[PDB]
Amino acid sequence: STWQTFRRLWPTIAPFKAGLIVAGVALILNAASDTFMLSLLKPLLDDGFGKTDRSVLVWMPLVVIGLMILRGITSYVSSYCISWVSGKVVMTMRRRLFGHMMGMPVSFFDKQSTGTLLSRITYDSEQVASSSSGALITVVREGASIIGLFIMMFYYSWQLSIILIVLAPIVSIAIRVVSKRFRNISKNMQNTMGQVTTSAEQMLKGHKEVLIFGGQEVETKRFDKVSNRMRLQGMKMVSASSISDPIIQLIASLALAFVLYAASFPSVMDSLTAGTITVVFSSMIALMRPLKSLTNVNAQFQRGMAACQTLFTILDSEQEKDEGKRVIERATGDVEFRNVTFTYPGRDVPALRNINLKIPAGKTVALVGRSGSGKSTIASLITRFYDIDEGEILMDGHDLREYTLASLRNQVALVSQNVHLFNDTVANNIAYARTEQYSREQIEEAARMAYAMDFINKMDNGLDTVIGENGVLLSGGQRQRIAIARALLRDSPILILDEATSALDTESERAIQAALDELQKNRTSLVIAHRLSTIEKADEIVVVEDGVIVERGTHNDLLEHRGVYAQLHKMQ
Amino acid sequence: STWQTFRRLWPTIAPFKAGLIVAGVALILNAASDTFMLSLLKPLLDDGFGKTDRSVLVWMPLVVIGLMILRGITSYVSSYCISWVSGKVVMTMRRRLFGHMMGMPVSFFDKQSTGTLLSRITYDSEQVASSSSGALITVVREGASIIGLFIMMFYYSWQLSIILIVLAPIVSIAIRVVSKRFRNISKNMQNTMGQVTTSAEQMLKGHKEVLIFGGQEVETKRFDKVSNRMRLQGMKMVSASSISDPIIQLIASLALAFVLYAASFPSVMDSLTAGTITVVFSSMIALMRPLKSLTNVNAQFQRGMAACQTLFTILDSEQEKDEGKRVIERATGDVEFRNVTFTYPGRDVPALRNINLKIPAGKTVALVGRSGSGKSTIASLITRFYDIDEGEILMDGHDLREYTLASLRNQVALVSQNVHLFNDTVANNIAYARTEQYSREQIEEAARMAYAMDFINKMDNGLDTVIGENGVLLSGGQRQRIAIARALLRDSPILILDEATSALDTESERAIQAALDELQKNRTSLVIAHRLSTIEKADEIVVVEDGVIVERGTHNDLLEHRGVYAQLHKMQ
Ligand SMILES: C[C@H](Oc1ccc2ccc(/C=C/C(=O)O)c(C3CC3)c2c1)c1c(Cl)ccc(Cl)c1F
Ligand SMILES: C[C@H](Oc1ccc2ccc(/C=C/C(=O)O)c(C3CC3)c2c1)c1c(Cl)ccc(Cl)c1F
């Protein structure tokens, strides 16, 4: 199943064919030069030696020098042009693949990790590029070499050529059966690999359990046995790998010796002089390598095309499905969660069960709970990063999923100290998507209201300073201030803040708190605060623990009573 | 700094020299056969053209076959013997390395995970073996080849030999400067490598942060720019390699052409016949790959030896130091922790601060706290898995660190459902540390008292059934029962159990609870229980939260009052 998916891959290189033609003529001319080198070397030098070498002997070195200059030039041109085509095609493939990955659910990003994801992407792209390019160049160049060497062989005493071509099927089938016999079964030695991995793993905390049990000699004996086993397995693998090649080499020498013995038959040395037999056998020795190269590159073609297929499968699986198609721009902000039921993949215990809550506009709602609880899940669900597994939430008389994903996600802004900064200038990062729609004067006024004047003055480039640099030049407080400024500039109707990830150990936090209060004063919001002042200033507080509401009552009455809530706040 | 650390490595193979000598004679004879092939081919073939064609032309195909049989036999023998030596030396090295890591503190097992430790060890061992073996075999074989081909060259018209040997220093410095010029530095492309990862992770979990911006076009443009840059960098690297190689090829051809033009000078064709020049040039061509490999193996030797050096550093780094040297076997069990202060590496907030507690013998102490709290750290410190950073704990009038590590860890037994199962038989895993000192009748009686009769009867081999199999054949309840049986058989004076990792969703738990109560009835212990019945049956309960005691009082009085503790138990 490779032809169909190679044909499907043709369009991404269809307009890129001038480089292919340039490489395809460069490689053919390269093989032609390679054959023509032997052509003008061996017979001319070994036949002009008979009282005529005075001219051809000094003629030869210039020919050799020019031929090698041509061969090197063609090699450089072909490699550079194939690299150009491969770079352009991987550029296009990476671009489309990243574009597809950006607009697809967050769960995929969760159940992979950034490092392994990007390693997969880049490594697989370069792998398919290298495999396909190598297969193409080897097929073209070595097929041209085989054709040229057969042409020269038939032009020089076709009898040896026909002997070789009739011996070819026997040698080929012998090599095929030997190679098939000498391929091992890689489905048993994994038991030893897994066993040693477990003994390292089940006996690390089990080393604590080995120390607790006191046994150290038993582990050494067990590792002795398993290491002896894996050493034996590896030695057997090396023995197979080293018994493979000499058999093929010996069969090749049987073929060459049979050809030489056929040459021993008379009536053909009459037309065969020293130069002719010399060039014929040199042609055979040169032809030795290309066939092995051809088989190995068919193998690597299959290998790389498998990776191309799995990359296509990765590109094809699902997307950001917009089943709603009921776009409602400029949402009023009627927030009310009901019948919330969702769980992480694989797990069978839902994070929330029949959770019901209301966050009316114009009122302040405080989210209080332990770190690592379901508050983060609820906040993510409010932004519809991951759709609720069960239940439905209706906003302003319409379902949350009914509204367009872009429309819903645009009306909500989340500000947190853990919001990383995009690798762009500070002015650019303040307007990550509204750079062209925001006036410079308005942005400057917002930044002045963002309490960033002290940071702007200290900046070398002021408001145009390049922020980011993998977080080396940006601090946590600066990142939080930039996030607050971005939220204020966006001025979304509903704001959900996650202060749990923030650290309270801040030297200067009063200004940040005042700025946050000013930003949240005009627009109603429900933030998960972690400060006593913010909790006290909240208009309404709902007690929810472990994704469930345990106590219901007025926030002011609960604060005045100072019961379980006060003790919990004092403890944490 | 390679000679000294290679000399330090000599003892591990010093007794192992018969295989080295066998390989060293096999490789020399292989190179001799390689030279002797061209030897008896070319001048004798020329003598065939001199009216002696029938005599030698039928004689060649048998010499060729015999020579290739000898070459293949020597290749197989040398590869097999070198593999045997390498396998045995890495066997010894792996054994010693595993023995060293067994007795060295726990933090290593944590700060590298099991995969990035064992893959490290196995890959590095096979890497150093392959690198050293390849360097040795290439140096010996290819030096023998160079010596033999120069011997033939001097034996046949030494003029060309001296003409090339005088050119060798000229060519070798040009090759050295050319190779250096194209040895690029990898200093800046990592910025793009990290930049693409930053761009991916910025909106991966920050799709809502991408939605905070509200657009994806900016991300697509940024990825366009960065992908163009990285494609250009890869283009430049490929171009550098593809201009590097043909320059050396062309310089080699200049050298060969100059040799041929020197042969064009008269007064030396008088002693040079067609076969002589043929074999001379064949030798010159054949030497091309040898010197390339001989010049390249330095890099591979260094690359392998660096991995060997870092393996030595890993084997050297610190140890399980027993600073106590005050072994007190058969401890009474006077448990009292005081001034406990310890933190994880890197962090600046200690897990516990001036923690003081007492667990007198003959009394039951219950450890109650939230999941993931400092109870696990306290339990680990009681077993001295990781020494306390600050403070001191005295047991039975002597410091905890004063007693021998083996002696201290032997007197304490930890039973939990997460206890890993050793890859051995059920009977073997029951006495994983004291199999030889345990009577069969006593083990059978303990197993009968272990409530394992139902599982033993269902086992195909009964008590001799092979447990483990990477946990496929063992269930969580069976693992917990086996751990309880092992603890009962050991019958340590002090038992610390971690029931937090256990799962309460067990179909049959009454028998396990009864067995645990029977095991803990005779010997006093302080276990971290998670069941209401176990908490109620506890003689003394201490309220500790966040590594600190908030409330102090009688357990019975607190239970009767049913205040904060009852509400916390009902909630969780
Ligand atoms: C008659 C024969 O043809 C063939 C036909 C299929 C082959 C498939 C694989 C390989 C090598 C695989 C490897 O090295 O792993 C060879 C060989 C030895 C060169 C093949 C030679 C032939 C040989 Cl045996 C020698 C020289 C010439 Cl010119 C030749 F045609
Ligand atoms: C004059 C030259 O000597 C030398 C001396 C050091 C070298 C170091 C490396 C390499 C290969 C590098 C690569 O392929 O990357 C070669 C070459 C071309 C064969 C070296 C040739 C020479 C040649 Cl051109 C032919 C035969 C002989 Cl006996 C010989 F000495």
Short mmCIF file of N, CA and C in Angstrom, two decimals, chain A residues 163-255:
data_model
loop_
_atom_site.label_atom_id
_atom_site.label_comp_id
_atom_site.label_asym_id
_atom_site.label_seq_id
_atom_site.Cartn_x
_atom_site.Cartn_y
_atom_site.Cartn_z
N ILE A 163 27.26 -14.70 -20.68
CA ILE A 163 27.52 -15.65 -19.60
C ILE A 163 27.08 -15.06 -18.27
N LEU A 164 27.44 -13.80 -18.02
CA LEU A 164 27.02 -13.16 -16.78
C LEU A 164 25.51 -13.03 -16.70
N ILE A 165 24.86 -12.65 -17.80
CA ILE A 165 23.42 -12.41 -17.72
C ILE A 165 22.66 -13.72 -17.54
N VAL A 166 23.17 -14.83 -18.07
CA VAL A 166 22.50 -16.11 -17.82
C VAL A 166 22.84 -16.65 -16.44
N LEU A 167 23.99 -16.28 -15.86
CA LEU A 167 24.27 -16.64 -14.48
C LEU A 167 23.55 -15.74 -13.48
N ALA A 168 23.04 -14.59 -13.93
CA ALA A 168 22.40 -13.65 -13.02
C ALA A 168 21.21 -14.23 -12.26
N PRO A 169 20.25 -14.94 -12.89
CA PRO A 169 19.12 -15.45 -12.09
C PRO A 169 19.53 -16.41 -10.98
N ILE A 170 20.51 -17.28 -11.24
CA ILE A 170 20.93 -18.24 -10.22
C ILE A 170 21.55 -17.53 -9.03
N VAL A 171 22.47 -16.60 -9.31
CA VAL A 171 23.11 -15.85 -8.23
C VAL A 171 22.08 -15.03 -7.47
N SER A 172 21.15 -14.40 -8.20
CA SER A 172 20.15 -13.56 -7.55
C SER A 172 19.25 -14.38 -6.63
N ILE A 173 18.79 -15.55 -7.09
CA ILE A 173 17.92 -16.36 -6.25
C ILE A 173 18.69 -16.91 -5.05
N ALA A 174 19.97 -17.25 -5.25
CA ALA A 174 20.78 -17.72 -4.13
C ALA A 174 20.94 -16.63 -3.08
N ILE A 175 21.24 -15.41 -3.51
CA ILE A 175 21.40 -14.31 -2.56
C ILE A 175 20.07 -14.02 -1.87
N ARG A 176 18.97 -14.10 -2.61
CA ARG A 176 17.66 -13.84 -2.02
C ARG A 176 17.34 -14.86 -0.93
N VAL A 177 17.58 -16.14 -1.21
CA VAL A 177 17.25 -17.16 -0.22
C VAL A 177 18.19 -17.07 0.98
N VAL A 178 19.47 -16.73 0.75
CA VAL A 178 20.39 -16.57 1.87
C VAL A 178 19.96 -15.40 2.75
N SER A 179 19.61 -14.27 2.14
CA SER A 179 19.19 -13.10 2.91
C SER A 179 17.91 -13.39 3.68
N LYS A 180 16.96 -14.09 3.06
CA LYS A 180 15.73 -14.44 3.76
C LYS A 180 16.01 -15.37 4.94
N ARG A 181 16.91 -16.34 4.75
CA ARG A 181 17.23 -17.27 5.83
C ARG A 181 17.94 -16.56 6.98
N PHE A 182 18.75 -15.55 6.67
CA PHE A 182 19.57 -14.89 7.68
C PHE A 182 18.93 -13.61 8.21
N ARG A 183 17.61 -13.58 8.33
CA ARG A 183 16.90 -12.51 9.00
C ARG A 183 16.25 -13.08 10.25
N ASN A 184 16.61 -12.55 11.41
CA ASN A 184 16.22 -13.13 12.68
C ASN A 184 14.82 -12.68 13.09
N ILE A 185 14.33 -13.27 14.18
CA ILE A 185 13.01 -12.99 14.72
C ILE A 185 13.18 -12.08 15.92
N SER A 186 12.77 -10.82 15.77
CA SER A 186 12.92 -9.82 16.83
C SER A 186 11.64 -9.73 17.66
N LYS A 187 11.23 -10.88 18.20
CA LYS A 187 10.05 -10.92 19.07
C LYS A 187 10.28 -11.71 20.35
N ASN A 188 11.53 -12.06 20.68
CA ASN A 188 11.82 -12.82 21.89
C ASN A 188 12.80 -12.14 22.82
N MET A 189 13.82 -11.46 22.29
CA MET A 189 14.82 -10.81 23.13
C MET A 189 14.25 -9.62 23.89
N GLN A 190 13.06 -9.15 23.53
CA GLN A 190 12.43 -8.08 24.30
C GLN A 190 12.11 -8.52 25.72
N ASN A 191 11.96 -9.83 25.93
CA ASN A 191 11.70 -10.34 27.28
C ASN A 191 12.87 -10.04 28.21
N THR A 192 14.10 -10.21 27.72
CA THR A 192 15.27 -9.88 28.53
C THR A 192 15.40 -8.37 28.72
N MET A 193 15.13 -7.60 27.66
CA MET A 193 15.15 -6.15 27.78
C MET A 193 14.14 -5.67 28.81
N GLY A 194 12.90 -6.15 28.71
CA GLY A 194 11.90 -5.79 29.70
C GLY A 194 12.24 -6.27 31.09
N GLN A 195 12.86 -7.45 31.19
CA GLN A 195 13.24 -7.98 32.49
C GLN A 195 14.29 -7.11 33.17
N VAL A 196 15.32 -6.70 32.43
CA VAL A 196 16.35 -5.85 33.03
C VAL A 196 15.78 -4.47 33.33
N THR A 197 14.90 -3.95 32.47
CA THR A 197 14.26 -2.67 32.75
C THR A 197 13.44 -2.74 34.03
N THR A 198 12.69 -3.83 34.22
CA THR A 198 11.93 -4.01 35.44
C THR A 198 12.84 -4.12 36.65
N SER A 199 13.91 -4.92 36.54
CA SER A 199 14.82 -5.09 37.67
C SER A 199 15.47 -3.78 38.06
N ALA A 200 15.71 -2.89 37.10
CA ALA A 200 16.16 -1.55 37.45
C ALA A 200 15.03 -0.73 38.07
N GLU A 201 13.80 -0.92 37.58
CA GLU A 201 12.66 -0.12 38.01
C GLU A 201 11.97 -0.70 39.24
N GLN A 202 11.53 -1.96 39.15
CA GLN A 202 10.82 -2.56 40.28
C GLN A 202 11.73 -2.71 41.48
N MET A 203 13.04 -2.57 41.27
CA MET A 203 14.01 -2.60 42.36
C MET A 203 14.79 -1.30 42.50
N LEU A 204 14.17 -0.16 42.21
CA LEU A 204 14.67 1.12 42.70
C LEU A 204 13.93 1.54 43.97
N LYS A 205 12.62 1.76 43.85
CA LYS A 205 11.77 1.72 45.03
C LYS A 205 11.80 0.33 45.64
N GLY A 206 12.05 -0.69 44.82
CA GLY A 206 12.34 -2.01 45.34
C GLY A 206 13.75 -2.17 45.84
N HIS A 207 14.67 -1.27 45.45
CA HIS A 207 15.94 -1.18 46.15
C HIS A 207 15.72 -0.66 47.56
N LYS A 208 14.83 0.32 47.71
CA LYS A 208 14.34 0.66 49.03
C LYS A 208 13.69 -0.54 49.69
N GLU A 209 12.96 -1.35 48.91
CA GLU A 209 12.44 -2.62 49.39
C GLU A 209 13.49 -3.72 49.41
N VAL A 210 14.59 -3.57 48.66
CA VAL A 210 15.72 -4.48 48.82
C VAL A 210 16.51 -4.12 50.07
N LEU A 211 16.74 -2.82 50.28
CA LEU A 211 17.36 -2.39 51.53
C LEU A 211 16.50 -2.76 52.73
N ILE A 212 15.18 -2.57 52.62
CA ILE A 212 14.29 -2.95 53.70
C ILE A 212 14.36 -4.46 53.94
N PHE A 213 14.33 -5.25 52.86
CA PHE A 213 14.47 -6.69 53.01
C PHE A 213 15.91 -7.08 53.33
N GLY A 214 16.88 -6.23 53.01
CA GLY A 214 18.27 -6.51 53.26
C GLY A 214 18.97 -7.32 52.19
N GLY A 215 18.25 -7.76 51.16
CA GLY A 215 18.84 -8.59 50.14
C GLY A 215 19.61 -7.77 49.13
N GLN A 216 20.90 -8.06 48.96
CA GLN A 216 21.71 -7.42 47.94
C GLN A 216 22.36 -8.48 47.06
N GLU A 217 22.75 -9.61 47.66
CA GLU A 217 23.36 -10.69 46.90
C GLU A 217 22.38 -11.31 45.91
N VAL A 218 21.11 -11.45 46.30
CA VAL A 218 20.11 -12.05 45.42
C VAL A 218 19.95 -11.22 44.16
N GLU A 219 19.91 -9.89 44.31
CA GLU A 219 19.79 -9.02 43.14
C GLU A 219 21.01 -9.14 42.24
N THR A 220 22.20 -9.24 42.83
CA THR A 220 23.41 -9.39 42.02
C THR A 220 23.38 -10.70 41.24
N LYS A 221 22.95 -11.79 41.87
CA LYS A 221 22.86 -13.06 41.15
C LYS A 221 21.83 -13.00 40.03
N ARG A 222 20.67 -12.40 40.30
CA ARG A 222 19.65 -12.29 39.26
C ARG A 222 20.15 -11.46 38.09
N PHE A 223 20.83 -10.35 38.37
CA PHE A 223 21.37 -9.54 37.28
C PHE A 223 22.48 -10.28 36.55
N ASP A 224 23.25 -11.09 37.27
CA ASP A 224 24.26 -11.93 36.62
C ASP A 224 23.61 -12.84 35.59
N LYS A 225 22.52 -13.51 35.98
CA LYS A 225 21.84 -14.42 35.06
C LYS A 225 21.28 -13.67 33.86
N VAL A 226 20.57 -12.56 34.11
CA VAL A 226 19.90 -11.87 33.01
C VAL A 226 20.93 -11.23 32.08
N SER A 227 22.03 -10.71 32.63
CA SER A 227 23.07 -10.12 31.81
C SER A 227 23.80 -11.17 30.99
N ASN A 228 24.02 -12.36 31.56
CA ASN A 228 24.56 -13.45 30.76
C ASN A 228 23.63 -13.78 29.60
N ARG A 229 22.32 -13.82 29.87
CA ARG A 229 21.37 -14.11 28.81
C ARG A 229 21.43 -13.07 27.70
N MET A 230 21.43 -11.78 28.06
CA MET A 230 21.43 -10.75 27.03
C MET A 230 22.75 -10.69 26.29
N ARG A 231 23.86 -10.98 26.97
CA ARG A 231 25.14 -11.08 26.27
C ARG A 231 25.13 -12.21 25.26
N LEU A 232 24.57 -13.36 25.63
CA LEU A 232 24.46 -14.47 24.68
C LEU A 232 23.60 -14.08 23.49
N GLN A 233 22.48 -13.41 23.74
CA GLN A 233 21.61 -12.99 22.64
C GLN A 233 22.33 -12.03 21.70
N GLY A 234 23.02 -11.03 22.26
CA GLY A 234 23.75 -10.09 21.42
C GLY A 234 24.86 -10.75 20.63
N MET A 235 25.58 -11.68 21.26
CA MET A 235 26.63 -12.41 20.55
C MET A 235 26.05 -13.23 19.40
N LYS A 236 24.88 -13.84 19.62
CA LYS A 236 24.23 -14.58 18.54
C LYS A 236 23.82 -13.65 17.40
N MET A 237 23.30 -12.47 17.73
CA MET A 237 22.94 -11.51 16.69
C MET A 237 24.16 -11.11 15.87
N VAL A 238 25.28 -10.84 16.55
CA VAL A 238 26.49 -10.45 15.84
C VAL A 238 27.01 -11.61 14.99
N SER A 239 26.90 -12.84 15.49
CA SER A 239 27.31 -14.00 14.71
C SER A 239 26.49 -14.13 13.44
N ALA A 240 25.18 -13.92 13.54
CA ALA A 240 24.34 -13.95 12.34
C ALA A 240 24.73 -12.84 11.37
N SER A 241 24.93 -11.62 11.89
CA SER A 241 25.28 -10.50 11.03
C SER A 241 26.62 -10.70 10.35
N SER A 242 27.54 -11.41 11.00
CA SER A 242 28.86 -11.65 10.44
C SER A 242 28.95 -12.90 9.58
N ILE A 243 27.99 -13.82 9.71
CA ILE A 243 27.94 -14.95 8.80
C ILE A 243 27.14 -14.61 7.55
N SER A 244 26.34 -13.55 7.60
CA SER A 244 25.61 -13.11 6.41
C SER A 244 26.55 -12.76 5.25
N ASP A 245 27.35 -11.71 5.41
CA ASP A 245 28.08 -11.10 4.30
C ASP A 245 29.06 -12.04 3.59
N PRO A 246 29.93 -12.79 4.28
CA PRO A 246 30.91 -13.60 3.55
C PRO A 246 30.29 -14.63 2.63
N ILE A 247 29.08 -15.11 2.93
CA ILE A 247 28.41 -16.05 2.03
C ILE A 247 28.11 -15.37 0.69
N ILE A 248 27.58 -14.15 0.74
CA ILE A 248 27.30 -13.42 -0.50
C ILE A 248 28.59 -13.10 -1.24
N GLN A 249 29.63 -12.71 -0.51
CA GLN A 249 30.90 -12.43 -1.17
C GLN A 249 31.45 -13.68 -1.86
N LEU A 250 31.34 -14.83 -1.19
CA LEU A 250 31.82 -16.08 -1.77
C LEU A 250 31.01 -16.47 -3.00
N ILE A 251 29.69 -16.28 -2.96
CA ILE A 251 28.87 -16.57 -4.13
C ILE A 251 29.25 -15.67 -5.30
N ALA A 252 29.51 -14.39 -5.01
CA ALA A 252 29.96 -13.48 -6.05
C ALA A 252 31.28 -13.96 -6.65
N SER A 253 32.18 -14.46 -5.81
CA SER A 253 33.44 -14.96 -6.34
C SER A 253 33.27 -16.25 -7.13
N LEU A 254 32.33 -17.11 -6.74
CA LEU A 254 32.00 -18.25 -7.60
C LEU A 254 31.53 -17.78 -8.97
N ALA A 255 30.67 -16.76 -9.00
CA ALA A 255 30.21 -16.24 -10.29
C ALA A 255 31.37 -15.71 -11.12
#
